[PDB]
Amino acid sequence: EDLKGHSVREWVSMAGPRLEIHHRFKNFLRTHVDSHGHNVFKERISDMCKENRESLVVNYEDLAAREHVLAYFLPEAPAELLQIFDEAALEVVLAMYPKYDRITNHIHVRISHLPLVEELRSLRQLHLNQLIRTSGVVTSCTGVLPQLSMVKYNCNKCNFVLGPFCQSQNQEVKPGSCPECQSAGPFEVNMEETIYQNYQRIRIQESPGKVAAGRLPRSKDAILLADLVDSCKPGDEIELTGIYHNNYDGSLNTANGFPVFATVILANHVAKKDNKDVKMITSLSKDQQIGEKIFASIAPSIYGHEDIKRGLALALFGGEPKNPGGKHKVRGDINVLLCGDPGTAKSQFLKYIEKVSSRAIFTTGQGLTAYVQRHPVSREWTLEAGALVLADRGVCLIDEFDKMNDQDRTSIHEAMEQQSISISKAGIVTSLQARCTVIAAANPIGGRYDPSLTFSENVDLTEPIISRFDILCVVRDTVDPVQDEMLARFVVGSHVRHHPSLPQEVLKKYIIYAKERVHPKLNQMDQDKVAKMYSDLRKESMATGSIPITVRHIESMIRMAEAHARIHLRDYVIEDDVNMAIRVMLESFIDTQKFSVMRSMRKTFARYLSFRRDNNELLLFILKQLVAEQVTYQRNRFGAQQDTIEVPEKDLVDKARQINIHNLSAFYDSELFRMNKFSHDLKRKMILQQF
Amino acid sequence: RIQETQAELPRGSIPRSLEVILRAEAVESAQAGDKCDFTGTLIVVPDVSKLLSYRLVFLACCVAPTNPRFGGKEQTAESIKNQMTVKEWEKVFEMSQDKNLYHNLCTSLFPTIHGNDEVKRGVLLMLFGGVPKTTGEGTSLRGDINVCIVGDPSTAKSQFLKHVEEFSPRAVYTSGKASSAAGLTAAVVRDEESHEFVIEAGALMLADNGVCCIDEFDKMDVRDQVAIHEAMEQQTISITKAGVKATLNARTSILAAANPISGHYDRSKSLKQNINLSAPIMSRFDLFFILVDECNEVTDYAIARRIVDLHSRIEESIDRVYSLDDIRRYLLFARQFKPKISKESEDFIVEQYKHLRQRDGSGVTKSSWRI
Amino acid sequence: WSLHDSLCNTSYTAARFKLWSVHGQKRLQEFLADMGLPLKQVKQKFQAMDISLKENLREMIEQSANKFGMKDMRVQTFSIHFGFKHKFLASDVVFATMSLMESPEKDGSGTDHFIQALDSLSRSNLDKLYHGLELAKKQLRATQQTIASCLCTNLVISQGPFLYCSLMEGTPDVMLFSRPASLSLLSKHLLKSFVCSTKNRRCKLLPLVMAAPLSMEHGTVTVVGIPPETDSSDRKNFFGRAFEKAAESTSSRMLHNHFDLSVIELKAEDRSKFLDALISLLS
Amino acid sequence: FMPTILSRFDMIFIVKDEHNEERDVMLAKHVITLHVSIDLAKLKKFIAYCRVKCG
DNA sequence: TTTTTTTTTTT
Numbered sequence A: 001e002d003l004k005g006h007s008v009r010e011w012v013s014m015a016g017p018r019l020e021i022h023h024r025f026k027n028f029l030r031t032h033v034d035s036h037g038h039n040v041f042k043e044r045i046s047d048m049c050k051e052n053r054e055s056l057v058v059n060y061e062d063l064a065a066r067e068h069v070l071a072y073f074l075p076e077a078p079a080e081l082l083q084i085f086d087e088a089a090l091e092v093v094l095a096m097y098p099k100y101d102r103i104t105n106h107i108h109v110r111i112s113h114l115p116l117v118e119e120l121r122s123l124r125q126l127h128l129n130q131l132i133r134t135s136g137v138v139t140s141c142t143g144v145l146p147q148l149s150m151v152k153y154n155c156n157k158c159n160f161v162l163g164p165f166c167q168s169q170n171q172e173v174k175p176g177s178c179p180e181c182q183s184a185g186p187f188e189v190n191m192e193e194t195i196y197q198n199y200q201r202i203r204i205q206e207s208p209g210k211v212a213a214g215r216l217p218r219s220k221d222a223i224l225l226a227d228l229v230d231s232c233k234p235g236d237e238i239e240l241t242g243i244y245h246n247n248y249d250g251s252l253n254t255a256n257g258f259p260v261f262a263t264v265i266l267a268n269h270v271a272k273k274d275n276k277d278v279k280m281i282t283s284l285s286k287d288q289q290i291g292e293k294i295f296a297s298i299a300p301s302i303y304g305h306e307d308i309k310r311g312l313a314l315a316l317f318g319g320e321p322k323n324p325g326g327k328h329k330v331r332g333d334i335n336v337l338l339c340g341d342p343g344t345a346k347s348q349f350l351k352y353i354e355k356v357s358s359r360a361i362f363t364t365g366q367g368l369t370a371y372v373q374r375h376p377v378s379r380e381w382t383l384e385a386g387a388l389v390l391a392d393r394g395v396c397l398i399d400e401f402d403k404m405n406d407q408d409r410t411s412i413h414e415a416m417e418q419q420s421i422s423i424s425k426a427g428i429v430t431s432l433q434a435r436c437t438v439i440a441a442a443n444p445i446g447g448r449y450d451p452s453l454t455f456s457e458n459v460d461l462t463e464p465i466i467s468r469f470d471i472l473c474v475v476r477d478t479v480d481p482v483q484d485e486m487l488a489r490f491v492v493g494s495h496v497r498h499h500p501s502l503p504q505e506v507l508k509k510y511i512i513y514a515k516e517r518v519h520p521k522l523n524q525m526d527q528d529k530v531a532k533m534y535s536d537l538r539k540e541s542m543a544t545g546s547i548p549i550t551v552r553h554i555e556s557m558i559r560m561a562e563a564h565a566r567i568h569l570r571d572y573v574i575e576d577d578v579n580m581a582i583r584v585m586l587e588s589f590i591d592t593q594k595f596s597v598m599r600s601m602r603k604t605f606a607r608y609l610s611f612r613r614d615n616n617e618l619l620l621f622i623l624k625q626l627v628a629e630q631v632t633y634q635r636n637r638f639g640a641q642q643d644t645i646e647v648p649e650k651d652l653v654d655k656a657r658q659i660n661i662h663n664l665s666a667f668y669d670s671e672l673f674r675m676n677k678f679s680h681d682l683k684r685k686m687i688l689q690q691f
Numbered sequence B: 001r002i003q004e005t006q007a008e009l010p011r012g013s014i015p016r017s018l019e020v021i022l023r024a025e026a027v028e029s030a031q032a033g034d035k036c037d038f039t040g041t042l043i044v045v046p047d048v049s050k051l052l053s054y055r056l057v058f059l060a061c062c063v064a065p066t067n068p069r070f071g072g073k074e075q076t077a078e079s080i081k082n083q084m085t086v087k088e089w090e091k092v093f094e095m096s097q098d099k100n101l102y103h104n105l106c107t108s109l110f111p112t113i114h115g116n117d118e119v120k121r122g123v124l125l126m127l128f129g130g131v132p133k134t135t136g137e138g139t140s141l142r143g144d145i146n147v148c149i150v151g152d153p154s155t156a157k158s159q160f161l162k163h164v165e166e167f168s169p170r171a172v173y174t175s176g177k178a179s180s181a182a183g184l185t186a187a188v189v190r191d192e193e194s195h196e197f198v199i200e201a202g203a204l205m206l207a208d209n210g211v212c213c214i215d216e217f218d219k220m221d222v223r224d225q226v227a228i229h230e231a232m233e234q235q236t237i238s239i240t241k242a243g244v245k246a247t248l249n250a251r252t253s254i255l256a257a258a259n260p261i262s263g264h265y266d267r268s269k270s271l272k273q274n275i276n277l278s279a280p281i282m283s284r285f286d287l288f289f290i291l292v293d294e295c296n297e298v299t300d301y302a303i304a305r306r307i308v309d310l311h312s313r314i315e316e317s318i319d320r321v322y323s324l325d326d327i328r329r330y331l332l333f334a335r336q337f338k339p340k341i342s343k344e345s346e347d348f349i350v351e352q353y354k355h356l357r358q359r360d361g362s363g364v365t366k367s368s369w370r371i
Numbered sequence C: 001w002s003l004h005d006s007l008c009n010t011s012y013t014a015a016r017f018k019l020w021s022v023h024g025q026k027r028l029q030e031f032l033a034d035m036g037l038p039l040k041q042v043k044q045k046f047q048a049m050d051i052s053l054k055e056n057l058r059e060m061i062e063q064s065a066n067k068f069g070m071k072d073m074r075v076q077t078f079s080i081h082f083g084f085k086h087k088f089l090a091s092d093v094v095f096a097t098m099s100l101m102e103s104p105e106k107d108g109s110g111t112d113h114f115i116q117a118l119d120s121l122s123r124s125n126l127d128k129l130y131h132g133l134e135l136a137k138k139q140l141r142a143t144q145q146t147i148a149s150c151l152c153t154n155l156v157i158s159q160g161p162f163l164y165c166s167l168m169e170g171t172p173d174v175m176l177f178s179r180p181a182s183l184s185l186l187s188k189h190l191l192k193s194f195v196c197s198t199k200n201r202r203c204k205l206l207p208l209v210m211a212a213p214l215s216m217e218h219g220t221v222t223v224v225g226i227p228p229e230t231d232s233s234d235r236k237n238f239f240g241r242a243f244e245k246a247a248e249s250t251s252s253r254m255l256h257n258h259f260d261l262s263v264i265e266l267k268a269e270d271r272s273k274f275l276d277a278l279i280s281l282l283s
Numbered sequence D: 001f002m003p004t005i006l007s008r009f010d011m012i013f014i015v016k017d018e019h020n021e022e023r024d025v026m027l028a029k030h031v032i033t034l035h036v037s038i039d040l041a042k043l044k045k046f047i048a049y050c051r052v053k054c055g
Numbered sequence E: 001t002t003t004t005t006t007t008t009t010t011t
């Protein structure tokens, strides 16, 4: 019988049960097929040996299936079963690979998903020395320090090395008196025969919103040994699995006044819970019309703003960070700066880009650089990373840009055109790297953006800073009846399906793929296609109170050139996406202009550039204004928010004569204006507007 | 560590405190901000560093709330509808079936306030609370509504707040001039015993899922109105300090009272010029009750009559139905539904949002804090 | 080199192991693991590898290559020692000389590299040999990055009686093979990788013909021809006649400039005019 | 700008902006001079010796 | 060598 009347701890420590368990584990290691007739621990051990990993995973459920008695002995006395399993897996591997002795000569078996997921606040004294599975964020980690594992001293009066004592993680090992000269004294270690092992200590704490319902969040310690160290960084969400081991502390006893012991989790398996094939992508990119299909995949909820959707999509994948051969270090990062009156889903545009992107971080402007910090655990005055070095390759989401401080302002600009920070702090003089794309949103002064002044006035920002941004989108608002329903219905419906009674799969894997397998090239056929525009537009802008497109705009345009090499896999500059690059680089410049200049420059260029746009949107641009202005008339004399606005026809083609389309019936058939709640009548000429 | 309850404080004294030691399965019954009722033995404890000096310590064995709203034993409609004693449940039903209920809670909650019929209603709808939702992405919609009052001197502002804070259980009361940033939201304190920086809970936290009554909201400093907005927006409280990194929940509803700039409320300007709150904060309230002391004379008889009545018949002339203990029960019951929206009501709502924007329309009139 | 960078580049284990497809790159890992060679010693230079591993390396490699289908792994060569640290195998001198004479970057007339390679055969010039071993490395690491192109892109056309390929200038490290002498080896290794790669039974026994651009100004390419590959190929090529008769039939412009006949320079426009007549001629 | 902080200098150049279309041809030139991407390296080492040898 | 609160000199 493998169960007799003793303590489970002391049953397994007896020679008989020890040997029985030892032989029992081998038979499971060698013979265990999984639903296909595959010795899983034959291929898995192999894949472990093809990397020199000395760590074997044992899923607990199968151990319970193929073995009824061990999977019940295990979480009772795991300080010895996990030792016997080591010597079993060793003798298995040294049979499947008889030379592996030259690789670390020691195997640890981890254990995966015990069936007893638990909380971090419900650990009571019942669980002392019992295998446990938990969860929660990690909030610290010391450095990987070396700890004694098999110490060996040497006597100071005889030149003889004492016995190889083992080190237990509760009390400093104590050597006796020299069995060769009885010279009991202060021995010192012998650095040459002693064996060491890695070591790291972390402080895990409850997840933010998971269980911390109406109280404060508790925390615990954990000790990662040799193979585990650096499995997790501050901010990760992990799920430990480890003996819950206690040890006596003399300080707590002097604070609480009672005999109180400290506890710590000797981690045994750490499995992160976070976010981590082309043959479709070939034709999906070869659709030739992936632009529209991807634009309406970001900003999943927020309606409208297919304008700024374009710019932010351009920013997300990025561009090409070419190295100029003249030692000029042009940058390959697109930085955006939103702005607009409060209540227009700017912050949501930030938060969704937090999710969709990768390796992203976030901050408010109300910590930007590395700073000296007294470590929670180690109690040393180290240096900690800021908020511009954690996006050293990804994105940095700044919020409340206006609320930055003078030191913060003088520190943000340095990283734009240099992308490299120096820290001559109290810690030590260093020079680190920072290659991030900045995505921020400012606010309008006076609680509303008013486009009589230039944008450089309502933004409340230092002038050489706005130059460090590529795109300048301006969010604005207006009381517009037909969009009131459009936005209301959306919000109301989003409140109907959220309460307890291109999808997000293509584009994440796509920003992973298309980030890598493209390297856009640069020919010289576009080199003269642009200057013909600059020579004109420079005069056109300088003529009035404005500064024309300058070199820091040509750089942004040429950066956004490749911004579509990532979507199309095109990677070849063509006179097609140059129509797009110039279009965007003027889109982000006509808006940041004066009252009558934002329209004079439009009347020139928006008709000059031959916007590669819909022929239909230019139809709407007319009658939308012609009905809005008529409502404005019929309010300033009557005041009644009338139900059905009425506008006869003749007015529309009068203004359509300027763009020379005169097409109404092919637009009347088009359902691209029914949504805007309009009408027309052949015999009445009325463009009847309902709402 | 427990602190002397409020109703025992001798006048003109700072409240004492003592250490209680829960030592069993009773180990996490008491949380911060609660009003439990401990029952154990008083013991003496030495100073173990020199093992003298002794200090008193309470050694509790049982702990239970001081006044159970439902005397059965102490979370959905049925778990509570079980503890309802026969009279309790035959009364809650009677009220829920009552018609004109929405006028017998006002008349029975604020029995000594003549007028302002449009403020009591808002206060009630604040007490009942909305439906808190969590979007699938991971964000969360605010479920409870916030309310601010702004008015002339001596118009019964602090009286609404005192009424609400003495009626409601787990609702805290603070002034604005005598507070702090790290006292409202959350602090960080060095416990030299553990020689570590730990988190202290603030007024916005030990009133969680209740109501925080801020009087004189516009006397707070410029930097103390920032920490409160960072909490009123995301419903959470971040901490990033010496060795502490955390994010705490705060699902309180705020009832704030303020004063116009220069004493009186000037009715020829927008709101942003009559009050000195920040710009962001004025957006996070979404219910304002501007009170004005219209120099009338038919009221100045009514208010006079009511005050002199209250002062002549001190405990009488208050004839409210639905005694105050009963309303707590009805309010603990009816705060466990999650009403839904029918399609007709959704259409009505979008039409009303249509009919609200255009009132602010140009030409005919003008209003304050644009819709 | 290191023991790892020389398995990934010998065009005899870079073919069997199929070290261009992630699916079979783990074969190398398994081969290393079957010997007890740490993955950290195998990546380091061979002269610095620990002394306890290299005892019987040349036997534990021949053995563990039977278990993978590579039984011709030991060859018969010679080796020379001069002094304290000078130890050459007779196939290192060859790969160094062969790459001093065919260095890509040209610094004068055609007989400027010849002299520098004739120099590095006497023992008084061990500073050129020891230098011509860094070109021979740079070449071998820029050949398995081309045979990896024409096999993860399938640029080996089966044009009938013979395979066929061609190159693109835009691909990096394709101007290195511009010389009409350093092109034969690239093709002869391409055939060895291909024959091992393809699944057909016909293509595995067809000779290859290759063309790569020579001169952009004259607009001409260079063309070679290599016998049908096999283990015991007699090595008796036959293209010096085919190309001659094909240029004779089409009556195009060709140059049989070298001493071997199977290398020709051809106008970029007479490519197809030549190739079709050749297809018909070989038949 | 006071007549005194202005007088703290000695040389005033009111720089002028030309928008001429031949000037714009110069600008179109300068466009690709950046689009693509007596020497200073000896000018500096010349000054370093000129400043220190003339009186 | 860290927070937080409170008083007084200084840019």
Ligand SMILES: Nc1ncnc2c1ncn2[C@@H]1O[C@H](COP(=O)(O)OP(=O)(O)OP(O)(O)=S)[C@@H](O)[C@H]1O
Residues within 6 Å of the ligand: B112, B113, B114, B115, B152, B153, B154, B155, B156, B157, B158, B159, B259, B303, B306, B307
């Ligand atoms: N409408 C009213 N009905 C009944 N009593 C009233 C009314 N308005 C004022 N009072 C009484 O007058 C006093 C009002 O003082 P408070 O309400 O405490 O001051 P307040 O309204 O906060 O104004 P300030 O700004 O703080 S002085 C109380 O004693 C009320 O009982």
Ligand SMILES: Nc1ncnc2c1ncn2[C@@H]1O[C@H](COP(=O)(O)OP(=O)(O)O)[C@@H](O)[C@H]1O
Residues within 6 Å of the ligand: A301, A302, A303, A341, A342, A343, A344, A345, A346, A347, A348, A487
């Ligand atoms: N068009 C819209 N679609 C959806 N939600 C919107 C829209 N406009 C405003 N919102 C709401 O407004 C909130 C965003 O406010 P925000 O832009 O953060 O204000 P501020 O810019 O003052 O910080 C969102 O939570 C969203 O619910």
Ligand SMILES: [Mg+2]
Residues within 6 Å of the ligand: B157, B158
């Ligand atoms: Mg008051």
Ligand SMILES: [Zn+2]
Residues within 6 Å of the ligand: A155, A156, A157, A158, A159, A160, A178, A179, A180, A181, A182, A183
């Ligand atoms: Zn001794």
